[PDB]
Structures are given as C-alpha cells and as structure tokens.
A paper describes a structure:
Here, we report the functionalization of the BTB (bric à-brac, tramtrack and broad complex) domain from the transcriptional repressor BCL6 to serve as a promiscuous assembly block that may assist the crystallization of a guest protein. The 129-residue BCL6 BTB domain forms a symmetrical strand-exchanged homodimer that contains two lateral grooves that bind corepressors with high affinity. We showed that these can mediate the formation of a variety of highly porous lattices, and that a guest protein may be incorporated into a BTB-domain lattice by its genetic fusion to a corepressor peptide that binds to the lateral groove of the BTB domain with high affinity. We have shown that the surface of the BCL6 BTB domain contains versatile interaction interfaces with the potential to mediate diverse lattices in a range of crystallization conditions.
We next sought to adapt the BTB domain to form an assembly that might act as a crystallographic scaffold for hosting a guest protein of interest.
Numbering used by the authors:
A (entry chain A): 6 to 125
B (entry chain C): 1341 to 1356
C (entry chain B): 7 to 125
D (entry chain D): 1342 to 1356
The structure:
C-alpha cells in the first residue's frame, strides 16, 4: 500500500477559501465591529477562534448570521486577525500591535497573543 | 506502507 | 512585519476535518450509489472543479442532497473525500483505478496525475 | 520583514 502526502494541499485549500470569501461565496455570517462589517465562513472562524467556536457550537446560537462584537473591539485589529485566519500571515505595525493583541485575546486566539507579545 | 510527499499543487485554483 | 505561520493552513484543515467528523456546520450530503457522505460545500468547492460548478449553479446550489453519477464508486469517493480533508491520499492496487476514475469525474487532475505514477 | 513561526497557530478542536 501507499500514501501520498500533498504538502501544500492545506495551503491551497485555505487560499481557495479566501477566494470564496473575497467573492462572498457561501459566506454565512457578518461580524459587525462598531462601524465596520466583515463577512466570513463560520467554519473558518470556529477553526481559528475559541470565541467563535463556543458561539457556533451553542445550539441556540449556531444559526446566528450576524454577530455584534463588544463595542470596545478595534475594527482594524479584527480585520488583521480575519486576514490571518484566511492566509496564515499576521501583518503587524507599530501603531496597531496593541490593538491586534487585545483583539486576539478577546477572540481567544492564544497562540497569536503569544506571538504579538514578542513584538512589544 | 510507502509514504511519499508530493510538493506540487494538489487542487484547482479558484479565481479572484 | 509579517509573521508567516507555516503550519496554520494544516491546523485549519485538521479543525475542518474535526468539524466534519462531529457533523458541525455541514451543509450537504453526497450520495454515491445509496452511500451517504456529509461534508462542507466550501471544502468540496475548494478541492473539486465539479463541486465548484455544482455549488455555483443556480439550479443546484441550494440543494442539500447531491447525487453523483450512478457509475461512481463509493470507496473511491471516500478516499478522495478523506484526501480533501487531510492532504493524505491512500492508494491500494485493488482500488487505484477506481480512485483515479473518481478523481477524473470530480475534475481533480493533479490527483489523477499522481495516481498515474503508481500504475 | 518576514518571520517564520513553526508552532501551532490556533486551538485544536477536539474529536
Ligand atoms: Na463552510
Ligand atoms: Na446523514
């Protein structure tokens, strides 16, 4: 018997999921962060965030199509994390690292928080 | 079991 | 600065497979000669040109049940579905032709090209 | 500036 391990398969799947997101194909939720809105696939959000995982495994919240995050959450920080979920790349700047880290803590993304700590 | 890595693209690319 | 998480995509895919096995947010059942396989349309579209076409077709994109061609082998489909969700393609001498035929039907040409190396 | 991180990036969903 034989097993072939396609080493860029997962990356290729994730790129295609990001392309679906950019085209708004099969997205099933909007995340509202104060004045800004971001469409996504619940499966990707649950895969990456303990907060979204907990929301969408609640039987009474699984069908929510609109999520309003806490008013204190920074939209730019959320956008950076959403892009990370769909690309594997976390793009930080001196002016936004604190907001990214705070948003990652709120989203229960502990490994991203740990990375952010390294950049002050 | 013979395990082999394949490093090329595995699936189609969805256009932007 | 950009931090590249080199195992992030694999970690996402594993979590998507865990959601599949727990039947969380799956939105379609694929029927192959009366055998049923639940999945996420997004993953099927990401991996297969046929499913990409089906789930954007205005006449089929809202169906929760998709019936494949009656000549499609259920074992071959299961092998390809597992590959979609894990990156691992398991081949045996007794099923490689069925796997290859199923990949051709699903428009997964890169998988077909790999199978050809083992013929 | 690009920096690789090879550790787990996200939580692991249980079986
Ligand atoms: Na999905
Ligand atoms: Na079922």
């Amino acid at each position: 018997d034989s097993q072939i391990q396609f080493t860029r398969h997962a990356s290729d799947v994730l790129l295609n999921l990001n392309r679906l997101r950019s085209r708004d194909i099969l997205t099933d939720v909007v995340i509202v962060v104060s004045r800004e809105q971001f469409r996504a696939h619940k499966t990707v959000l649950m895969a990456c965030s303990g907060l979204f995982y907990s929301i969408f495994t609640d039987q009474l919240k699984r069908n929510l199509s609109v999520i309003n995050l806490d008013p204190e959450i920074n939209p730019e920080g959320f956008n950076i994390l959403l892009d990370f979920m769909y690309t594997s790349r976390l793009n930080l700047r001196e002016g936004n690292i604190m907001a990214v880290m705070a948003t990652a803590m709120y989203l229960q993304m502990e490994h991203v928080v740990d990375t952010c700590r390294k950049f002050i | 079991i013979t395990t082999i890595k394949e490093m090329g693209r595995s699936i189609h690319e969805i256009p932007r």
